Design a protein around this ligand. Structure first.
Ligand SMILES: O=C(O)/C=C/c1ccc(O)cc1
Ligand SMILES: O=C(O)/C=C/c1ccc(O)cc1
Lengths: 162, 162
């Protein structure tokens, strides 16, 4: 039920058609919480069946969203990063092959960072907690910081490899 | 087939029984590439069926591992971080509820960081590319940097919330 709360959250600022929900997943929401098309309407069906939407949130849906929002949950198990599995097995690579693999990864992370920086610039063309775009600013700065940090770590490791 | 290359990689430094593979997933490998018990023996069966292991790697298994190691792959889609979905929907929280949620997350990330720091200290009790423990050092420093960066971002956001 990976889309339950994304969808309830989308409806938090008032009614939307299904096309409009589908369209929200093609924009900024789908960079960090991607949906498959085949998941969306079945989730919409379940949510309606559960009393949480009728698409507008019901009182019940608002409560369900709110309860999830404030719930403190343990940090989950680490996300499997296939690149890092390779790094774990680096003993099986020559120094030159390690360099090539890490350099390729560094290029890709820097490239992803430039795409994020373009998105940031668009968003920011005076941020505060009270801004309506604060949630968007949170997911975009989180992604910026994550990729900057990855780039920094890769540069450090390459200085050990090279 | 999420365990294919983890398992081929484990066998890269010579023969192991299944218990010994199961035991490796309970240690450091299972912090960033967790296995379910129910996945391991079925993967072992497939790998044997495919000619990649007989447990020792065959020539074929070594080549398969090597080919995967050097393959340049696109960066995958972002890992769904359920906390970040909440942050995206922060408009539905009061300033006080936002503070409580972010503070709880900050405590948990700092806690995870102390566990990682204990693991680092153990590992490091003169690191180089040539060390046999370089792969372990890579996955542990990556995890350290990732959680330090998360903590830093959380502290920044809390200074905006508070
Ligand atoms: O998590 C990511 O990789 C990307 C997040 C993102 C968030 C908002 C945007 O406007 C663009 C990308
Ligand atoms: O990715 C993680 O969260 C943890 C990784 C980790 C790697 C090596 C260790 O010795 C402990 C934790």
């Amino acid at each position: 039920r990976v889309l339950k709360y994304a969808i309830l959250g989308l409806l938090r600022k008032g009614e939307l058609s299904g096309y409009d929900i589908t369209s929200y997943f093609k924009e900024e929401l789908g960079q960090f919480w991607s949906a498959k098309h085949s998941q969306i309407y079945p989730e919409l069906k379940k949510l309606t069946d559960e009393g949480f939407i009728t698409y507008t949130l019901t009182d019940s849906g608002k409560q369900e969203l709110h309860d999830w929002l404030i719930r403190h949950q343990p940090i989950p198990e680490t996300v499997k990063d296939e690149f890092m599995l390779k790094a774990y097995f680096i003993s099986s690579l020559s120094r030159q092959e390690a360099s090539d693999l890490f350099t390729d990864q560094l290029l890709k992370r820097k490239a992803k960072l430039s795409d994020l920086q373009g998105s940031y610039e668009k968003l920011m063309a005076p941020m505060s907690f009270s801004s309506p775009d604060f949630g968007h600013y949170l997911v975009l700065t989180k992604a910026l910081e994550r990729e900057k940090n990855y780039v920094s770590w890769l540069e450090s490791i390459l200085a050990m490899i090279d």
